Amino acid sequence: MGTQKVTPALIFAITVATIGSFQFGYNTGVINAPEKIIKEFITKTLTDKGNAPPSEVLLTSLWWLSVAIFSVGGMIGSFSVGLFVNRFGRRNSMLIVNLLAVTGGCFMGLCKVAKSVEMLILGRLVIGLFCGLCTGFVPMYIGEISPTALRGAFGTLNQLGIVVGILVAQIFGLEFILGSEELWPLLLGFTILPAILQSAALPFCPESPRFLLINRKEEENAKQILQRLWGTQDVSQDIQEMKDESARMSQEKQVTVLELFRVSSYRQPIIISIVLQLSQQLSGINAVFYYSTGIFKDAGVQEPWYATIGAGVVNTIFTVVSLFLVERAGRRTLHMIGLGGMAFCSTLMTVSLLLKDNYNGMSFVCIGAILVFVAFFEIGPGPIPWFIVAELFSQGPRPAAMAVAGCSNWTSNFLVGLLFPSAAHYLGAYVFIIFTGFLITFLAFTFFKVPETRGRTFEDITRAFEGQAH
Ligand SMILES: CCCCCCCC/C=C/CCCCCCCC(=O)OC[C@H](O)CO
Ligand SMILES: CCCCCCCC/C=C\CCCCCCCC(=O)OC[C@H](O)CO
Ligand SMILES: CCCCCCCC/C=C\CCCCCCCC(=O)OC[C@H](O)CO
Ligand SMILES: OC[C@H]1O[C@H](O)[C@H](O)[C@@H](O)[C@@H]1O
C-alpha cells in the first residue's frame, strides 16, 4: 500500500456510489414475487376501462413486457454512459441520473391509483434506463478512485450492492411486508428512496481524480483529492501514472465505439471485456435464480420462497467471500473457479432432475446444486466482470469500452430471458447443459486469454496489450 490508506472519506465515496449498484439489484429482483398480484392488476385495469378480460396469452405478453422492458432500458442506458461521464464527470453523472430513478419509481408507485398498465411499463423502462447507466457509472467511478492494490476488492463492493439489492427486494416482496395486493406499488416505488439518499450524499463525494487530472488537466485539484481520499501526502507514483495516461490520451484520437473494434490494441481487451460479460449472463444465473422457486417446489421444498431467499443469502455471503479473496487469488483464479464450479452444478441440476422421480434422494441434490451454483457464481463471475472492464483500459477508451461491455451484459441478460423458456420447453432438464457448454467454453477462454490485472496500473495493463498487438 506504500503510504496509501482506506479512509472514511474513501469508504463514504464508494458506499454512496454503490447505492446505484443496490438499485440495479433491487430492480432486477423486485418484480418476481408480485407477479400474480400484478397480473391481477392488469386484468382489473383492462376490465375497469371497459374491455374484455385479457386472455392468458395477453396477460402473459403484458407481464413479459413489464419484466423485459427493464432489460431494454438497461441495454440503452448502459450503452449511453459515454454521453455522460466525460461531459459531466463521473460523480455528477450519478447525481443527474437520479432524476430517472425518481421518475421511474414514481410511475411505478402511481400506476395502480392511475389504473395505468402503460405507467407500469413506462416506469420499468425508465428505471431500466437508470439502472443501465448505473451499471456503467459505478464501476468506472470506483475503478478510478480506488487505490491500485485494492481496486478489485473495492470493485467487488459494486456486486455486493447488487446482491444486497436483490436480497432486499426478495424480502420486501414477502406478502406480510410489501408484496401484497395493497402495498405492491410501494414495493416498486421503494426505488425512489435510495435515489433520494444517494442524491443528497453525492455532492459531498469527490470527483474522480483521474477524470480531473487526465480529462480536465487539473493536476493540483486531482492531487489534493487523492491525498485526502487515501490519507497520505505522498501520491507521486499515482499522480505520475496519471500524467503518463494523460500524455498517452493526448496522442491518440478520441475513442469511439467502432474504433474499439478496429484498433488491435483495443480489440483484445474489448473482446475480453465482452466475453467476460457473456460468461456472467450465459452462466444462466438469472434463469437459475428466477426458476429456482419452481425447481425447489418440484424437488419437494414445502415452502420454496424461503429457499429462494436462502439462495439470496448465499448470493450475498459468497460475494463477501470473493471480496476478501480477489486481491490474493487474483481475477483469473476466482473467475475460473466460479465458471468451473457452476459447470459442475448446472450439470448436476440436469442429472438430479433426470433421476429424481426414479432415485429417492436426488431431490436433495437438485436443491444443493442450485445453492452451490449461486455460491460459485459469486466467487468470480458475479463481481469480476462488472469491475474488470475499468482495469482493462486506460482513461481515454474506458467510457466507450464500458458502454460496449455493459451493453453486451444487458443484451445477453435479455437474450437468456428471451430464449430460455423455449429451450427449457424442448430440452427439459437438459436445458442446463446449454449453460454448462457456455461455462466450459468461457472457462477455456479465461484460462488462455484473460491477463491477470491484480495490483497492476492501467498504464502497465494497456502497455502489455500494445506490446502484444505489435
Ligand atoms: C437525506 C434524505 C434521504 C431520504 C431518506 C431515505 C433513506 C432510506 C433508504 C434506505 C435504503 C438505502 C440503501 C442504500 C444502498 C446501500 C449500498 C450497499 O448495499 O453497499 C454496497 C457495498 O456494501 C458497498 O458499500
Ligand atoms: C418467490 C414466490 C414464488 C411466486 C412467484 C414466482 C416468481 C418468483 C420466483 C423467483 C424469485 C426470485 C427473486 C430474486 C431475483 C432473481 C434475479 C432475476 O434475474 O430475476 C428474474 C428476472 O428478472 C425476471 O424473470
Ligand atoms: C412466455 C415467457 C414467460 C413470461 C415472462 C417471464 C420471463 C421474463 C420476461 C422477459 C425476459 C427479459 C429478459 C431479461 C430477464 C433476465 C433473464 C431471466 O430472468 O431468464 C429467466 C426468465 O424468467 C425466462 O427465461
Ligand atoms: O447477483 C446476480 C446478479 O448480478 C449479476 O452481476 C448480474 O448483473 C445480474 O444479471 C444478476 O442477476
Numbering used by the authors: 1 to 470
Give the authors' words:
Following the same principle for the engineering of XylE-WW, we introduced two Trp substitutions, S64W and I305W, on the extracellular segments of TM2 and TM8 of GLUT3, respectively. The two bulky substituents were expected to trap GLUT3 in an outward-facing conformation. Consistently, the transport activity of GLUT3exo was abolished as measured in proteoliposome-based counterflow assay. To validate the conformational state of GLUT3exo, we resolved the crystal structure of GLUT3exo in complex with glucose at 2.1 Å using LCP crystallization approach. The two bulky residues, Trp64 and Trp305, wedge into the two lateral interfaces of the N and C domains, i.e., between TM2 and TM11 and between TM5 and TM8, respectively, to lock the outward-facing conformation. Except for these two Trp substitutions, the structure of GLUT3exo is nearly identical to that of the outward-occluded GLUT3-glucose with a root-mean-square deviation (RMSD) of 0.236 Å over 402 Cα atoms. Consistent with its trapped outward-facing conformation, GLUT3exo can only recognize the exofacial inhibitor phloretin, with a KD of 15.5 ± 1.5 μM. Its affinity with the endofacial inhibitor CCB was not detectable.
The major facilitator superfamily (MFS) glucose transporters (GLUTs), encoded by the SLC2 genes, mediate the transmembrane movement of various hexoses and derivatives in different tissues. Exposure of the substrate-binding site to either side of the membrane is achieved through rocker-switch rotation of the two domains as well as local conformational changes exemplified by the bending of TM722. The ligands that specifically bind to the outward- or inward-facing conformers of a transporter, wherein the substrate binding pocket is accessible to the extracellular or intracellular milieu, respectively, are defined as the exofacial or endofacial inhibitors.
